[PDB]
């Protein structure tokens, strides 16, 4: 829900900020069946 | 009232589940002056925030 053109939070306001006029699609899905272990490797600045 | 209000002390606290601001943006709050803040405090169900 942070990955939208003008939303805010610990991801979107720092690293992956979308443009205010973003033209595009955001496609997302759960990956618990593939990437859970916990899996302390997936990481954010 | 009659005090200095650091709002980055709140906004950088990773403990908050939401921080919805309706006539101000949270990164602007340190640029601002107000007459009184009025903090209202209570508990509810999480289905109702």
UniProtKB/Swiss-Prot annotation, chain A:
Subunit structure: Binds to host ACE2. RBD also interacts with the N-linked glycan on 'Asn-90' of ACE2. Cleavage of S generates a polybasic C-terminal sequence on S1 that binds to host Neuropilin-1 (NRP1) and Neuropilin-2 (NRP2) receptors. Interacts with host integrin alpha-5/beta-1 (ITGA5:ITGB1) and with ACE2 in complex with integrin alpha-5/beta-1 (ITGA5:ITGB1). May interact via cytoplasmic c-terminus with M protein. May interact (via N-terminus) with host bilirubin and biliverdin, thereby preventing antibody binding to the SARS-CoV-2 spike NTD via an allosteric mechanism.
Region (Immunodominant HLA epitope recognized by the CD8+): 39-45
Domain of life (superkingdom): Viruses
Outcome recorded upon mutating residue 37 to T: In strain: Omicron/BQ.1.1
Official protein name in the record: Spike protein S1
Role according to the record: Attaches the virion to the cell membrane by interacting with host receptor, initiating the infection. The major receptor is host ACE2. When S2/S2' has been cleaved, binding to the receptor triggers direct fusion at the cell membrane. When S2/S2' has not been cleaved, binding to the receptor results in internalization of the virus by endocytosis using host TFRC and GRM2 and leading to fusion of the virion membrane with the host endosomal membrane. Alternatively, may use NRP1/NRP2 and integrin as entry receptors.
Species for this entry: Severe acute respiratory syndrome coronavirus 2 (2019-nCoV)
Effect of residue 43 to R: In strain: Delta/B.1.617.2, Epsilon/B.1.427/B.1.429, Kappa/B.1.617.1, Lambda/C.37, 19B/501Y, Omicron/BA.4, Omicron/BA.5, Omicron/BQ.1.1; Contributes to cellular immunity evasion and increases infectivity
